[PDB]
């Protein structure tokens, strides 16, 4: 399932898509919710397979990916992308010395998530 993390877009939403873009399966379903309910033009998708290393490097957690391999490369790509890491995953919090969003740390982490909605 982790290896199925990414898909390929045919057809524009309201967002930063277009032909052949390799975007996360999660961002596709988020677009689904918001666009189907409101309307706008639809986007056709197809699922893609990435093995291990590539899949890891593709995930939207660049400190995760930077901790894995190809530190140099991943940093540059994210730097050019102006990428913003929202810090939902594990090792992110690990490194920051925070509460892991798993298990015992579930409570605190969901509290911050609701605090995002409240301004």
């Amino acid at each position: 399932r982790q290896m199925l993390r990414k898909a390929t877009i045919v057809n524009a939403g309201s967002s930063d898509f277009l032909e052949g873009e390799q975007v996360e399966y999660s961002r596709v379903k988020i677009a689904n919710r918001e666009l189907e309910a409101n309307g706008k033009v639809g986007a056709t998708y197809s699922r893609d397979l990435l093995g291990i290393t590539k899949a890891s490097l593709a995930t939207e957690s660049f400190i995760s990916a930077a901790s894995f391999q190809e530190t140099t490369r991943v940093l540059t790509e994210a730097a050019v992308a102006g990428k913003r890491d929202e810090l939902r995953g594990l090792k992110e919090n690990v490194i920051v010395g925070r509460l892991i969003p798993a298990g015992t740390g579930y409570a605190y982490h969901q509290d911050r998530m609701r605090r995002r909605a409240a301004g």
Partner: protein, 302 residues
């Protein structure tokens, strides 16, 4: 890392059909073993002891399994981690039992790293162990004879054989299995027979206990002709595609057809064959089909 139980049930109907693995020689891992503690998606029907039906969305506990064992259902759609609807993570239901605890997994537990540790662990162990305890090297490669254990009918699925002079039922198909039917018609035992294997009893006839029904020499896969006549040589020249090994005495030899490595630069595309011609000369055709029998001997075919 990111895979965690966020939801109890997103409400997916999708799922993967798990079988009892009858890979060749036996049923190495059964359905019970593969499915225990999993949530099911959908109900499976089979003509059985009384027309089996089994309610869905249900986690199959040990005892559920026992009941379904008596019914003998073969294929089960089970709700999978993959077929999960949940974003960034999975459902309690789609995962199932947390094996270490015995119960349903706890929402929030990091199942991802769970899986990883379990799967990395043994690899790391199964290297170290037979490397510092097994001070030598060997493998069970006496894949000599098949032997039917209990008295039942012989029934074959997927092959097309051609009867010879000595009288063996020689198999020329890559898709061959040799199964065992019991009293009232089921697939009990299963064997895997490769290309070129001599058979004894074909289709329909009963085998008594522990009788030799199949046979083949291990270290040598023969290619066996379906039709008769004189061997005609095509593109097997010496040095380009074959190597002369000849002695004195009455002047006997054994040709070795070498693969890509030993071939000179000119004999790259030359596909060596043995063409089936008759007493008259002309391509005798395999019975009922159009092929002029040209058996492509592979790399290093002695």
């Amino acid at each position: 890392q990111d895979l965690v139980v966020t939801e109890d049930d997103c409400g997916t109907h999708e799922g993967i059909m798990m079988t009892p693995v009858i890979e060749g020689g036996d049923v190495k891992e059964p359905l019970r073993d593969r499915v225990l503690g999993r949530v099911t998606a959908e109900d499976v029907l089979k003509p059985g002891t009384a027309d089996i039906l089994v309610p869905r969305n249900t986690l199959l506990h040990e005892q559920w399994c026992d009941l379904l064992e008596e019914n003998s259902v073969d294929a089960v759609k089970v709700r999978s981690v993959v077929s999960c609807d949940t974003d960034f993570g999975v459902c309690a239901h789609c995962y199932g039992r947390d094996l270490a605890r015995g119960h349903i997994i706890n929402k929030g537990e990091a199942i991802g790293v769970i899986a990883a540790q379990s799967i990395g662990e043994p690899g790391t162990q199964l290297t170290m162990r037979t490397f510092h305890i097994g001070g030598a090297a060997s493998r069970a490669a006496a894949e000599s004879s098949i032997q039917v254990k209990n008295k039942g009918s012989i029934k074959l699925s997927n092959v097309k054989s051609v009867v010879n002079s000595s009288g063996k039922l020689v198999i020329t198909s890559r898709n061959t299995e040799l199964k065992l039917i019991d009293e009232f018609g089921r697939t009990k035992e299963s064997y895997k027979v490769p290309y070129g294997a001599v058979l004894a009893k074909g289709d329909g006839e009963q085998v008594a206990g522990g009788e030799t029904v199949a046979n083949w020499d291990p270290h040598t896969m023969p290619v066996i002709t379906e039709v008769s006549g004189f061997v005609r040589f095509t593109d097997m020249i010496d040095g380009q595609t074959i190597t002369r090994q000849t002695d004195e005495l009455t002047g006997l030899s054994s040709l070795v057809v070498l693969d890509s490595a030993e071939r000179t630069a000119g004999g790259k595309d030359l596909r060596p064959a043995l063409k089936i011609v008759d007493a008259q000369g002309n391509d005798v055709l395999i019975p009922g089909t159009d092929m002029p029998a040209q058996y492509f001997l592979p790399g290093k075919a002695i």
